[PDB]
């Protein structure tokens, strides 16, 4: 089979976590940047690493990769977002009657944005055990 051992994958992962800006989606460009950054002996190891770097940079664009740093993997997504109004800036907030009793003890019964919905009338919230 073609299963890459942990030498290839370890060196590829630490090159990803150190040089995410220099890398891309082409194999042959990543082949050239690893051979100047890293001191790698005989050529068959340099080629196997750079293929995993290409296959790994393909996968980071689609979401998370568990082997590499979270801080970097999340930050790139952010860098690669502001909504114009906040999701917590609502006009109608639907609360229960029991919630409004809590706000009444919080002396916040004088809120305008509340809309006291009625709760459902059936007391059914458990699974029919058996």
């Amino acid at each position: 089979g073609r299963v890459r051992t942990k030498t290839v994958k370890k060196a590829a992962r630490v090159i990803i976590e150190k040089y995410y800006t220099r890398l891309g989606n082409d194999f042959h460009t990543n082949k050239r940047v690893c051979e100047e950054i890293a001191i790698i002996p005989s050529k068959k190891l340099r080629n196997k690493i750079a293929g995993y770097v290409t296959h790994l940079m393909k996968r980071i664009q689609r979401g998370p990769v568990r082997g590499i740093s979270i801080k970097l993997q999340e930050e790139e997504r952010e860098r690669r977002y502001v909504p114009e109004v906040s999701a917590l800036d609502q006009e109608i907030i639907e609360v229960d009657p029991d919630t409004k009793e809590m706000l009444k003890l919080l002396d916040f019964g004088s809120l305008s944005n509340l809309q006291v919905t009625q709760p459902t009338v059936g007391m059914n919230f458990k699974t029919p055990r058996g």
């Binding site: 979401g63 801080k71 502001v82 917590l88 029991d98 919630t99 706000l103 709760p119």
Partner: protein, 206 residues
């Protein structure tokens, strides 16, 4: 928040709490968490008293401000719904974030380069982050956590009673704790609202 008019919960904070859903707990109730519940309504969901969520948050903020070097506080979320709010708590505050899997032996194995020695531990969920809780009982490390109604309170020392299942509630709690620790320090004033919108902390999934 010792009966000070400067520190009382205002109207907009209550509106954000109600919009995010941080008052609605879970279906079950731990016996250690019974102190913070207003009442269980119908549909079996417990309502968290927001006056006690606000005062436990203000007590945790004093515990974070009482540490001189701000990098000695560590902030931990091992599930994805709180991984973004931890990384922005540490950029606004100056703490040390640990997102993703906590390595067993981060606090006790002193040989490794993964070894850290914090002075305070803030945790997004005491059930999901069970491993950094138990390791704090080896190195004399106090612990703040965001606790739901079913959360166990073994080794938590300040138990902020919020909702931590929904993605908006976690981000709002981390945002409001960041605002409180920055307000209690010498930086941003209590007059104007904070520049950071609280949607920088939410976890928008795909």
């Amino acid at each position: 928040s010792g009966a000070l008019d400067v520190l009382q919960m205002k109207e907009e904070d209550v509106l954000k709490f109600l919009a995010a859903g941080t008052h609605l707990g879970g279906t079950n109730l731990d016996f250690q968490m019974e102190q913070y519940i207003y009442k269980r309504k119908s549909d079996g969901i417990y309502i968290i008293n927001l006056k006690r969520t606000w005062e436990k948050l203000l007590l945790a903020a004093r515990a974070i401000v009482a540490i001189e070097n701000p990098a000695d506080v560590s902030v931990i979320s091992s599930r994805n719904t709180g991984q973004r709010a931890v990384l922005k708590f540490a950029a606004a505050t100056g703490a040390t974030p640990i997102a993703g899997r906590f390595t067993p032996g981060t606090f006790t194995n002193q040989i490794q380069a993964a070894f850290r020695e914090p002075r305070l531990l803030v945790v997004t969920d005491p059930r999901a982050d069970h491993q950094p809780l138990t390791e704090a009982s080896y190195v004399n490390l106090p612990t703040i956590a965001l606790c739901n109604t079913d959360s166990p309170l073994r080794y938590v020392d300040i138990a902020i009673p919020c909702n931590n299942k929904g993605a908006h509630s976690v981000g709002l709690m981390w945002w409001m704790l960041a605002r409180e620790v920055l307000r209690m320090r010498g930086t941003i004033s209590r007059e104007h609202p904070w520049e950071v919108m609280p949607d920088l902390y939410f976890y928008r999934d795909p």
